[model samples]
Target chain A: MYLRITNIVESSFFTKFIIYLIVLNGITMGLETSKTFMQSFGVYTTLFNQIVITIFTIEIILRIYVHRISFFKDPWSLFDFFVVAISLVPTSSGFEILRVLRVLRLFRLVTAVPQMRKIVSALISVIPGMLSVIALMTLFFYIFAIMATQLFGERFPEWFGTLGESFYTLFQVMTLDDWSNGIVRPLMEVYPYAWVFFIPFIFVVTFVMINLVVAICVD
Target chain B: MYLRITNIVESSFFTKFIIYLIVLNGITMGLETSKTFMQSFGVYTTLFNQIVITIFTIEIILRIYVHRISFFKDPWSLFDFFVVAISLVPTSSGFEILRVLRVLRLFRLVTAVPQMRKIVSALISVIPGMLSVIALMTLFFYIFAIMATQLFGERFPEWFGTLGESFYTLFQVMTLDDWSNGIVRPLMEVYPYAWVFFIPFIFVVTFVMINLVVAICVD
Candidate 1:
């Protein structure tokens, strides 16, 4: 019986069938987002979701039966099991937010696809280097945040009034989104030389420091 | 004479002096941003800027003379040349914004500091891989932008009304910056299953796509 279950679960056909179901499940959930469609076919969408969840539950059971207690040993298997289990949570009034958890089921595609699995593992491998860069960045942020608070706190209370606000603004600047127009340009108008502080802050944080993280990860 | 000029330009002392001038020029330009500081020492700042520009002009002349036409062949030299040349541009009322270009002098630090130079080239080395990922991202954005415009354009005109707006908002979401509160949660109130669209979108673009970029860069 165990051999039969293992053979079936490990079959390419079974994997392809599960992949199709996941794709179908993704579409059903997407259709649920359309109000007009939902109004006309609400029951069908919900029914489809329920049916898909049931199949996923049974699929997990088969894998568990095939692998026995060792099923949870694999991280991907545990991830799949937890994602399917979360959907089983009752979406009561207080737990309506839990409904969002259902969307996590889509991430199963990463594990399902081989190329994606490789990409994910490659990313995981760089975490240590990224962590060191992050530590260095945090130090840079602390030093610069304190400097910003001291220099611009008096003039621009909203952005640099306190150390915390400085840190937040500095972080936004680090993203290079609207740092010039949104934050620094305004401060520059007030303090004329403010760019000295902020420009180097940006150079260090965005250009130098952040790139250090990327370099370490790439290396 | 050419050999003598080359010797001086290549000397450790000359490089150290140039680095100092760049640092001092950076500080002077920074102080120019402070109205109070400028008010008290406005003339001195102006005189200092004029002196630094003169020195930079002569320094470039020496470099060009030593390196000849080959001087312009090197990108860093070209970068340094342009940065200095822009400072010489007349900062009349019509050209006031050019004043900001002076802050770019600070970037000379990247070329001056050996460590910073290596960091920058390493970043440049990853460009081809980054470009492929960017191409993939653009494809993802285009597909999702069209879908968003079709689905939510009518209701949330500001965010999803047009393809452009949807792309912008989606880019913001990809950054993972207040996306839930700033965007998705509000949409959820009107379209209860909106999470269906956005959650997968976030998972794909932010979690999957962005990490893919990082992975490629690291590798």
Candidate 2:
């Protein structure tokens, strides 16, 4: 009986079915986001959510029974188990975040799909290299933050008011989002050579330093 | 004679001198950014700038004379030539941006330092794989942008009102920068299940999709 249950759960057809349910559940959750859709079809959406939850619960129970103690060994299985378990918690006023967390079930697609799993494992493998790069970056940030606080603190108190704000603004610059128009240009109006501070900072921190991290991971 | 010039330019001492000038020029440019510093030593800074420009121009001319037409074959040489050439341009009212462009001369350190050159090349080598992952992300962005517009266009016009805006906002979310505080939480207040749309979006874009690009580059 145990063999039969394990074989059934491991079958490709069953996996495909579960994937489809996850997708459908995702759609229902998305539908729940629309005010008009919820107002009109609230009952049906809840029913669908309940049905999907029950199927997921049963699926996890079967997998746990089949894998027994081994089920805890797989991180993905634990992730899947916790995500479904969160959805089963009784919703209350104080536990509103739990309701929001149900959306996490969609992430199971990462473990469900083979290619995504491979990509995740590759990312995990590079964590050591990434950590070193991050350490170097943090050091740079500390030095720059101190310089910025000392240099721009008197003028642009809002941005470089303290070490914390300087770090935040520098992080924003690193993302290359609105570094120029948002931060540098305004500062340049006051300090004509402000580009000297910011341009090299961007070069070293964002372009060169970040790329070093990439190079290490690739190597 | 040509071999002699090539040897001189390639010599460690000469290269070291040029590297020192670049570093000094960077410091002077940084000093120029401070109004008080510029006011106190305006004449000296101008003299220093002229001297550095003259040195760089002579260096590039000598390199061209030595390497002949083959000088243009090397990207670093071309980069060096252009960076020096930019500094020679007359800074005019309309050409104010060129003043900012002078800051780019600092990037010469990348080519001057062999280790930095290796890191940059490693990043370039992974471009093809990065492009494929980027294409996948673009596709995801397009699909999600359309869905966001269709679902939230009526209520959140500023965010999802148009396709372009949706793409921009979604890109912001993908960066994982204040995503919950900046975009998603405000979105959830209107639609209780808005996380159904955003949580999965973050999971897919920030977690799954972005990491795939990293995976390809690392592999």
Candidate 3:
């Protein structure tokens, strides 16, 4: 009885669509992961997001019926069930921010099928390399931030406002901003040959970090 | 004879590096990419940056000697040549920031070998899809920005500070942060059932964008 139910759930198109929606949501969330910075427009976006979740609700009920209560026994399944249930909850404050939970939908994308196994494998391999590169980048940023604070602290006080500012510049670079204008050029006036300090930070973060990222998967 | 010189210029590693450097630098200039919001320390990093660029210069010279001028004729070869060369320019202004040009060096890694043709081909195939996805995302952000500016203009003055600010936030969402925290929460606060507005935008951007990007190379 159990085996038959499992087979039915696995073969169902509705199950597949739910899984697809989950993956789609994952990618979307990954792409738009900057929730804290956005304004009220996000609220409008979340309101429209329910249709997706409503479909997901239908998917969950169907799966439970097809596979029986035992389907929810697995931790992942329970996790899947919990997230959907929590998302449906009514609240004033806590639920407002729960929209961020949509990011968790990415996990469903990864675990949904055998093909996504490659993505998991790639992620696993890339992580160690990414970690080392990130560490190196962090170190590079720390050194650059300290130097910027020392050189341009007075002139660009607004930009070189604090240690926090330098870190923010690092984030900007990761997002692909050349950052030399706002950060480096201003410092160059007070300090000579500013590129002497500025350019290498860019090289390490961009060149070295990228090579390391691609090489991890290549290996 | 002119063609021969063009061939030679294209072949030489030093020349190629110079061109790539120039092109990449121009893009950097055009983009005016910025760094994080705050500032950090600065002295030691400037001194260290010189060493890295010097090494890069030496590598270009050495590679030129080994490969000869004919090597420049190849498109990717020329790409690599310029990326390194233009990057070597000294900063004359205090406001000129070329740090983002370093990301251009990632292009070099791709052109690192002749046999990387397959990867290049794959990248080419993916470009249209990526571009479309970017286009779709941009449109989504633009429309959302318009709505955001209209709906929350008064309540969240800081967020919708200006049309430019809205664009910048959207840009950030496009690059690094997702929209949930940055967009939805603010809206939900003002209008409790804002999820209706929020969900579909998330659905299209996240779901549709993912399938578009991934499916491009799938076939």
Candidate 4:
């Protein structure tokens, strides 16, 4: 049963048909979303969306016809079947719910494409390193907060008044923004020699950001 | 003369004296830097600053006494000599250029410290790999920008409007902003049926970002 369904899905005609449905879906989704903000133009958008849905229904009928007997063999095939099926229920009150479910049709696209499936698989494989980077970032933030509080607790009430303000400054630095215009400039003007803080900051950027990027790459 | 100067500089008493000077400089720099903006306490600040400078002057005198002819043998030692000498240059007219040089003294602290010097050296060694990561990032940005524009151009004017906007959105993704809110949300809204684009984008996020991270780590 599984082989029979795979055979049908692997056919060129079936591929083309699904491709057409995807294109129609893409067009209708675009029109409806764009229509929400443009009230006057949305009438045409609603009509276009309805037309796309009509076409999608035709495509679903064809898929069920092709794999009707072995639908239970592929869980994804059953999922797609039900998603489109639930969307077909008639009730104006529940139309919004149906529309949201229709959004899940997006997942079907990934299920249908071989290259995309491989790509998704690859992405799932890299979560650990990304999580580690997150952990490091959190620790770096904590250290910066502590240092800022210890050093600036008394003088710069606006910035060092709390740990949160220091975090904000560090966050801005992570983006490579000098932010000195807001934090350091005023201080430099008031006390012509306060450039010492900038030294440590430059050091952090040079040491921390630069090294982190290198480690992530080299690892 | 040079041997005599070396003998003085290497002497235990002289090393202790230099350590004292370093402590005094660190305190002075930190205090002045903190005060650059905290100008509330007036006469106390001014008097304290003067006292610090007088002590710094005396420290400089002792250094000069120890290293007479061959003072230029060490770059840092020369740096300290010039910074102090410049600070003494009388300036009744313009900005105190010499006072600004005091910040350079802080670098002496890092150079003299064993642990900090080791960390700084380690960081410097990672520069080549970091540069390679930056290069890879640039390529990824270009590829994503092209893919985003090509795939979603019709529906997302914000993303596909021009090459630049596409790059910007791609950059936002790199910064770990889910970007679903900005780019993907708007795309979904415009093209409700456009579940097609989601497949490719999800693939990129999961596959490309992860692979890129791995490549950087291993390479």
Candidate 5:
């Protein structure tokens, strides 16, 4: 009889029902954001959200009861527990930021299917590779930032005087954010050799970074 | 010997000399942009430029004299001839844009080295694959652009009323150009669920396009 409860939540049909409930609750929260809809059906969605949380909490408790302390072993199980724990906080007053965090409940869909779990797990696996490139890029930015600050500092003080200013403008240029007409061309009128500096940075940092990312993704 | 002239023009030293001259001219033109330097050293740079163009014209004419009609067969050879031919145009008058075409002379460096030529040739080979993905993205943009116009047209006419406005704003969103504070958040204040449309379009169009481009690059 005790084993029957474990089988119940693990059942395919029951799992599908939970997935449906998740989607429904997700849509409900989204619709609840609408002032027009919420104003008319405010009380009902509020009630619905409350009931949904209660059921989710009970489901966690039941899973915990069956699995014992091992319930925390699964990452998604912990995430579900954490998500429920936050919802437990009374959102009626001061902790409105936590109220907004209810959006994370929607993230539970990431582990809803085996395929999604594998996909996310694979992505997480690439984090170290991505971070290494990010670290390289960070070092790259530092060198360029200092170089820019020193070179263009005297003339274009606002853009290249401070390290932070240099960093911001360098990133802006890398972003293809109107660097031609906005930064480069205007600066070229004063410093015509600016392209010899900025364009190479794009080729080295931005273009090279793309090759690294694509190569890393392939890896 | 008649064969001596052909071998002379194709000699390693002469080829290397042309490459060196290309770099020197590229640097000179860049430095020519500096009014301060140009005012002082203007005459010398001008004289050097005239001499360099004369040498380039001779090189092309010699290559043509040796290769005859076959000189036009090689694309890079044709490109070199074209670059030198453009310099023959009078730039002392109102045709400043034509004078700017002098930059193309630097592009002859592509054919100076076999490796760079192979790299660029391979990139060009991928053009059809890249263009197919590009065509797909164009179609993708058109659908969402119209959908955005029809959906948000009534309320936010300025951003979504016209097809062009919708295209621009949609691109602005895809660009990660402050869509949160500038657009989505502001629109969300009114629509509350503006994300359902715009966010999916981003995932479908921009994110999907990135994957396609990456895949095409891999191919």
Candidate 6:
């Protein structure tokens, strides 16, 4: 009766079929943001979206049945299970925003496409090495903020009045934004010795961030 | 009489001595920017600057005499020649801003430091690889800006008014800076089909630029 429906689901053709459907659904959601498109093709768009979601739900069920309990073992496959669960909700007044979550279905492409999935996996492995660099940035950043506050707080109240102000000002300097002309030169004009604090701060902070990026790349 | 001045110039102690002098000269130049510091130590600073420049000129002369024209074979050695020539200009009324070029002396540290020299050499080699990626970005970016000027030019004059305006507006979007809420969604409200041009442009331009960076990294 099914004419080898089971074989159809597992085939490469079926894989490409879902790719088209996913891209089509992404376009449909993007169109939903426009009133003009919605006015003309609104009904078709909504119906197409509902149809895609139903097809998606069925696709997950087929996987769960074929792979059995092992289907949930692949984290992204279980991800499908959760997406179907959210998308199946009735679009009523109270939970309509949840319908916006439909846009997330596009992410399913990461798991579906072999190339993007590899890139994503490569990026994920880099997070572990980044933790120490992030910590190094944070703790010293706090001390620098405190140091800036203590050093320039009284005189440069507009910029370094408090710890939070120092945090933002120091961050602006870190961006290499007009730091010399806008902030540091003015401070130096008053203090004459302020560069003692600033020049080293610029090098230390900038070098640390550059190395953090280097760590990400080399890894 | 000169304690075998030839050996003195070749010795490690002479190299370390020059390092301290280079650092001290950097500090002296930085102080010249301060009004208050100048008021108090202005005479000393000027005299010290003159002393450093004289020493730097003599050092170059010694290098040339010892290396016997082979000194000029090193690009950095010639760089020092230009720096000394610039710094030797007496602080007269004419061409005072040339004094600012003294700061260029700081770059001498790259040749002085072995590690930084290697890093700079590594970076210089990557420029050839970056050239093609940068070319790919510029040509495509021009076409996309022209495409945008034609598509949304009349309706959204502020953003896509001309090739120049579109160039800037597209750059802002490429930065992903509030692009959706601020620009694209607003344009979509009017044109309804603007994203057809925009979404791909964003991905294409952003990916090309990203690959430019990745080229720098992997190289």
Q: Which stretches of candidate 2 lie over 4 Å from their true place?
A: A146-157, A162-164, A188-196, A213-217, B1-156, B160-168, B172-219
lDDT of 2 by residue, B1-219 (tens): 888888999899989999999899999898998999978898899899989999999999998998888989999899999988988888676668888898899999888888889999888877766654465456567657756766667789899877678888888888766655467656766875666777667645654454555565547
Output the lDDT of residue B215, model 1. 64
Candidate 5 structure lDDT: 0.75
lDDT of 6 by residue, B15-134 (tens): 788878877876675555455677999999888888888888888888777777688788778888887887777667685445544556765665565655665564456568667776
Considering TM-score, which of the candidate structures 2 and 6 is the better prediction for this target? 2
In terms of lDDT, the best-performing candidate is 2
Task: Write candidate 2's Cα lDDT for A1-219 as tens digits.
Answer: 989988999999989999999878866766666667879999999988988899999999999998888989999999999999999987676656567667778767667877667655655565575677678888999999999998897899767888876876676677565677778898988998889998898888757655754565455
DockQ for all candidate structures vs. native: 0.06, 0.05, 0.03, 0.05, 0.02, 0.03
DockQ score, prediction 4: 0.05
lDDT (10s digit) by residue, model 1, range B1-219:
888879999999989999999878766754565557778998998988899889888999999988888989988899999999888887576644466556667778767767556655655565665576668878999999999899888889878998877876676677565677777888888888878988888888766655754665556
What's candidate 6's DockQ score?
Answer: 0.03
Candidate 3 CAPRI level: incorrect
Give the backbone clash total of model 6: 0
Residue by residue across A1-219, what tens digits does model 3's lDDT show?
Answer: 756766756776756776677755544443243444345356644644667778777767767887567777765567678777766766356644454444444445444554444433433443564576668767878887887677666666655557765555444544444456555666677777877865766676678745763454354
* Clash-forming residue pairs, model 1: A191-B33, A192-B33, A192-B34, A193-B33, A193-B34, A218-B218
Question: Who is ahead in DockQ, 4 or 5?
Answer: 4
- Looking only at chain B, model 1 earns a TM-score of 0.84
Query: Candidate 4 on B1-219: residue-level lDDT in tens?
Result: 757765866678765665666666555544444444347554565566566556657756666676666666865567666665665665354654344444455454544444555554554555575566567666866787787787777666555756765765555544434456645667777677445655555565556546544544564
Q: Model 2 Cα displacement at B139 (Å)?
A: 10
Off by over 4 Å in 6: A1-212, A215-219, B1-6, B88-97, B141-199
State each candidate's chain A TM-score: 0.82, 0.81, 0.58, 0.49, 0.76, 0.68
Per-residue lDDT of model 4, residues A160-206, tens digit only: 65667777766765564534444654555565444465545654554
Candidate 3 per-residue C-alpha lDDT over B1-219 given as tens digits, one digit per residue, 9 for 90 to 100: 555544644466745665464454445433433333112323333444455467566766655655677667767767766876656766554434555564576565457544466678766767764553454455456556555554455577676545556667655554435444355445656864544544544434544444454455354
Which scores better on lDDT, 4 or 5?
A: 5
lDDT-based ranking, best first? 2, 1, 5, 6, 4, 3
